[PDB]
Amino acid sequence: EDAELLVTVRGGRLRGIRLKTPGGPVSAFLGIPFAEPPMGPRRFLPPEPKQPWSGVVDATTFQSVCYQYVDTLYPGFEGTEMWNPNRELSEDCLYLNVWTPYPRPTSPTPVLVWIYGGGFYSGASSLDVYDGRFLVQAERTVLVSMNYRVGAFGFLALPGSREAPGNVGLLDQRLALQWVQENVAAFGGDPTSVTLFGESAGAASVGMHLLSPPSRGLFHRAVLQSGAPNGPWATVGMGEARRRATQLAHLVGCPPNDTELVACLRTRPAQVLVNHEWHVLPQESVFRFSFVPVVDGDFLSDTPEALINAGDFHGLQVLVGVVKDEGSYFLVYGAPGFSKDNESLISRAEFLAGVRVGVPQVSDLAAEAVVLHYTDWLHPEDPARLREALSDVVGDHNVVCPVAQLAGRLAAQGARVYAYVFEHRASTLSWPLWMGVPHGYEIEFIFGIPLDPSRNYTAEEKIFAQRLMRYWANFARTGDPNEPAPQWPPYTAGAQQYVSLDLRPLEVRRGLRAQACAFWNRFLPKLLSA
Amino acid sequence: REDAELLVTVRGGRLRGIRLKTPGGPVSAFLGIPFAEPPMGPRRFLPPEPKQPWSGVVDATTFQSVCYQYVDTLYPGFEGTEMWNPNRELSEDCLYLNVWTPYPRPTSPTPVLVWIYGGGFYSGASSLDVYDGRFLVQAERTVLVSMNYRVGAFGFLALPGSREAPGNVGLLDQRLALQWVQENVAAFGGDPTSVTLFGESAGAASVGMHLLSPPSRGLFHRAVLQSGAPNGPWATVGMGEARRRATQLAHLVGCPPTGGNDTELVACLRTRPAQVLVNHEWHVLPQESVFRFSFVPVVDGDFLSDTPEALINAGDFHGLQVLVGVVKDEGSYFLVYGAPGFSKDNESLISRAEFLAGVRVGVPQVSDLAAEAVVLHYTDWLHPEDPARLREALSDVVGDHNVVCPVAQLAGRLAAQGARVYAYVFEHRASTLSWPLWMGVPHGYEIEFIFGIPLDPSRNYTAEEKIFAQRLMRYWANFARTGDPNEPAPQWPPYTAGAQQYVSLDLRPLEVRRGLRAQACAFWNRFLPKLLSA
Ligand SMILES: *[C@@H]1O[C@H](CO[C@@H]2O[C@@H](C)[C@@H](O)[C@@H](O)[C@@H]2O)[C@@H](O[C@@H]2O[C@H](CO)[C@@H](O)[C@H](O)[C@H]2NC(C)=O)[C@H](O)[C@H]1NC(C)=O
Ligand SMILES: *[C@@H]1O[C@H](CO[C@@H]2O[C@@H](C)[C@@H](O)[C@@H](O)[C@@H]2O)[C@@H](O[C@@H]2O[C@H](CO)[C@@H](O)[C@H](O)[C@H]2NC(C)=O)[C@H](O)[C@H]1NC(C)=O
Ligand SMILES: *[C@@H]1O[C@H](CO[C@@H]2O[C@@H](C)[C@@H](O)[C@@H](O)[C@@H]2O)[C@@H](O[C@@H]2O[C@H](CO)[C@@H](O)[C@H](O)[C@H]2NC(C)=O)[C@H](O)[C@H]1NC(C)=O
Ligand SMILES: *[C@@H]1O[C@H](CO)[C@@H](O)[C@H](O)[C@H]1NC(C)=O
Ligand SMILES: *[C@@H]1O[C@H](CO)[C@@H](O)[C@H](O)[C@H]1NC(C)=O
Secondary structure: OOHHHEEEEOOEEEEOEEEOOOOOOEEEEEEEEOEOOOOHHHOOOOOOEOOOOOOEEEOEOOOOEEOOOOOOOOOOOHHHHOOOOOOOEEOOOOEEEEEEEOOOOOOOEEEEEEEOOOOOOOOOOOOHHHOOHHHHHHHOOEEEEEOOOOHHHHHOOOOOOOOOOOOHHHHHHHHHHHHHHHHHHHHOEEEEEEEEEEEOHHHHHHHHHHOOHHHHOOOOEEEEEOOOOOOOOOOEOHHHHHHHHHHHHHHOOOOOOHHHHHHHHHOOOHHHHHHOHHHHOOOOOOOOOOOOOEOOOOOOOOOHHHHHHHOOOOOOEEEEEEEOOOOHHHHOOOOOOOOOOOOOOOOHHHHHHHHHHHOOOOOHHHHHHHHHHHOOOOOOOOHHHHHHHHHHHHHHHHHHHHHHHHHHHHHOOOOEEEEEEEOOOOOOOOOOHHHOOOOOOOHHHHOOHHHOOOOOOOHHHHHHHHHHHHHHHHHHHHOOOOOOOOOOOOEOOOOOEEEEEOOOOOEEEEOOOHHHHHHHHHHHHHHHOO | OOOHHHEEEEOOEEEEOEEEOOOOOOEEEEEEEEOEOOOOHHHOOOOOOEOOOOOOEEEOEOOOOEEOOOOOOOOOOOHHHHOOOOOOOEEOOOOEEEEEEEOOOOOOOEEEEEEEOOOOOOOOOOOOHHHOOHHHHHHHOOEEEEEOOOOHHHHHOOOOOOOOOOOOHHHHHHHHHHHHHHHHHHHHOEEEEEEEEEEEOHHHHHHHHHHOOHHHHOOOOEEEEEOOOOOOOOOOEOHHHHHHHHHHHHHHOOOOOOOOOHHHHHHHHHOOOHHHHHHOHHHHOOOOOOOOOOOOOEOOOOOOOOOHHHHHHOOOOOOOEEEEEEEOEOOHHHHOOOOOOOOOOOOOOOOHHHHHHHHHHHOOOOOHHHHHHHHHHHOOOOOOOOHHHHHHHHHHHHHHHHHHHHHHHHHHHHHHOOOEEEEEEEOOOOOOOOOOHHHOOEOOOOHHHHOOHHHOOOOOOOHHHHHHHHHHHHHHHHHHHHOOOOOOOOOOOOEOOOOOEEEEEOOOOOEEEEOOOHHHHHHHHHHHHHHHOO
16 A cells, blocks of 8 residues: 555545656545435535545545536537546535645645636536646645536525525535545645636636635635636625525426525426526526625625625735636627637628627617727727627626636735736637637636646647746745746736737736726616616 | 909999908908908898898998807917907898908919808807918918808797798808808919818817718818718707707797797797807706807708718718828816816816716716716726826827817728828917917817917927928828828828728827727717617
């Protein structure tokens, strides 16, 4: 036996596995149970800590994926299948994973905690693009990821009720963070140096832990990639959450009050709920998801926008950023005229129709304001400009401007913020050229996937991945990504400085689409209230 | 004895003129021809009556009085403002017109240019030196007519529905002069079947209203609108707001001893000295502002059967040629009349607080949300507080809202509905300009080049500017003769709703460009009206 892969945590003994890397081995402990399986009567309930066990838990392989919708838009296409579950689906899915260097560190090592995205309806810690072996070998930190409930199982809410309080998927993450505080030292980790990082809904999850006091004490630094808690998609109001929960029950034959409604939902197989998940949305749209965190005064005592404005953020360091073309990926899921298999050169009529699906549940006047700002009135009908304009609409509304607002408010209120735009299109990208650098395609570089010899990244891209891993790990260690070389300056509300990340050296630029984001963050709210 | 070239007979009687000297040769001028009975005493606020025939010879040898009006006092003695102030005595006896014709009189019918001065409908006169018609007539051999029309309350005080003060009588003054041209211009060698209206500022808005009034439309064939349009937010007023302003003016001068019977109210107003009415003219505006004037044309269903925008959108304009344009910096002149932080004597590098305050003065009587939309669009959010950018932004706000975007909307609708449109932007700053450099090419300072003022030997224009003026006079006269400013050489393409082509007018040859501030004017012409409705 290998003593380096035997660990005793508070709940019992674990057996890990030795993983290979072009730079040397790492230790991995995969599929560690941190909660009781939320099954049967425990569906929709907050998680319970895992009860202690006898014997040795086999922690050599990833555990099941939390039950979720499986994408079918392009069957077999690499660009979509890389996000689909690669393990069996189960409601018994509350497991986390620990990667440590080999041999295990004898000194307290900074910890990075990954929260995957997936619009709160999908995702898994077992996806190949989240493989932590290269980060842990290159930068010598402890790396933790957890699975958390998604879709109705994690975020269906009958607000006020005890049978379905909502946000339990977020409590899954918090419980894993508490598990890290109690057990990460047994792997060589330092519980006093924990950096949360996540992408898309994971970034929105990270931001929500920043704004929830019970979570705030479980970590010390935060990285938000292409997501923010204050977007128009990451939260839902109590009334709309209740309406969606009620319509789901109707679509699955329930009831035969909240107590009875939830009891009937608990009798339905997991797939039955998944099969009707998308039909509770109020309208045809993109970048909208059925069951997301709810603002009910508990996990979030107020809206994330209100909490960001009222918060004291001195002593907080955050790393935030976006990719160059945040919106293009979502357009093929419903904007008329868009497809991965052609140039998607849409007409003005399709552009106007696409604005309503990309900015759903918005008055006609506010939609007209969007069309005004995003039309080039010297070329109002040029298909290529319209394709790009609609990508900018979806991307600015949902990612760039929510992130810009978060960064500006945190910086103006005591936090040290570092901002980036990711501008390298991977040579291996399977999405068409017109999508540019699409949403989510900086992750593989952050995790050092180009170092995998089994893949076809260039030598320049391997250098690039090592650069990014160093930035991220420097920030985890010191709150500053810079190597003590062109310097990465902090983002401020006035100067609005960020850096571009690509094969070229760091270049400092001004403004995260300041013109467009003034519209979304300053004017549009004023219009909607009148 | 007498010179036969300076003696002409019109329908009303005989006239005697004068021989003007110009650097290029003699011109015949008939200045101060009465075309209406003096609108004095009981005739104040009433539509004009045609001039009764006279015996003997009327001496049309000098400009007549300026219609009673407010006199600017912002910069006393300053050349930049005094050039617009009355250069003749003020009087309500002011309904006279002027005719310039070549010497000797043309043998064949000659195209006619009719000038309508601006002045915000509260000021102006055809006697101003910058409107001197001798150079145009000499250089291009046209006949030029200009008329005086009543301004201020005397021309546009309206109690709608009352016959005592129906409103728009200043526009009826212009129409009567146009009817006079139809009946009498052939006696001067003019062709009544080739008449081109042209005007600037409120004169351009007047030209546009004649285009949209059927009784006026038959009196001319072509139109030139310089830095003005009838659809601006300042050129017309609703019936109720006209009545509120008229009622408030009478109240401020003691009439009646508020509102009540219209006949008695107007009769009380007619007993007031003309200066007393002028002394309170500016006090009836609903808010402090710039580019807003108290007594302007009223949309009452008569002269204008609807708003100018509705008439423009519903009009068939086939068979019409129009020449429209603006100067490069339309807003700057108006900012020193009330925007906080602005003066001709300093750089006017305003603060953000002064910019935000200026938006409410420059876009008056709109909701807080509408003002926020203006601030969003005209702020550079990468440099939100730089004084120089704020100064230029407020100038653009006032210029786009009041001139550029109204002109662009008119041009686009006319072109899309059968008219042929030629558009320009005037971009030359005169070497003799007295306004400070930060105002650029200000509103109104293309007029002197179109009238050929640089050819005046007493003035100090460069040789290039004299060539420039001669080129502009040729464009205008070519349009008057043929409906096309091009020489029968860089070509001036028509303006269309799609291509939106216009030319730059300056010392360089013609350069073709696209879009009259297309991005800005989409906000003013497409979005903002939808916001005001909700
Ligand atoms: C680009 O393609 C989209 C989607 O078409 C799909 O992909 C093609 C490669 C082919 O497999 C089609 O059969 C697919 O439907 C086009 O948008 C569609 O247009 C058709 C009419 O041709 C219409 O019936 C569908 O409803 C449209 N789909 C959507 C989602 O709006 C689009 O027109 C193409 N762009 C071009 C040709 O410029
Ligand atoms: C509004 O008043 C006019 C004028 O009233 C006349 O003049 C006043 C000074 C006073 O002397 C009144 O007694 C006068 O009647 C009215 O128009 C007059 O109406 C009467 C009866 O027809 C008569 O004097 C003449 O017809 C009109 N004289 C005018 C026009 O000078 C008018 O009817 C009143 N309108 C209303 C709605 O009351
Ligand atoms: C620029 O000037 C304006 C106007 O001031 C006038 O013009 C100056 C050149 C000088 O001749 C002054 O004596 C004149 O009064 C300034 O705006 C005024 O500022 C004063 C003092 O702060 C204030 O009382 C007035 O209300 C202001 N007037 C307006 C219309 O706003 C402005 O401050 C000057 N800007 C500078 C000096 O940077
Ligand atoms: C919910 O409804 C059931 C059936 O009507 C009833 O028996 C039960 O008491 C209710 N529970 C609550 C908490 O209201
Ligand atoms: C032109 O300049 C001369 C001096 O060179 C001056 O005497 C004359 O008054 C000026 N004419 C103007 C300003 O019209």
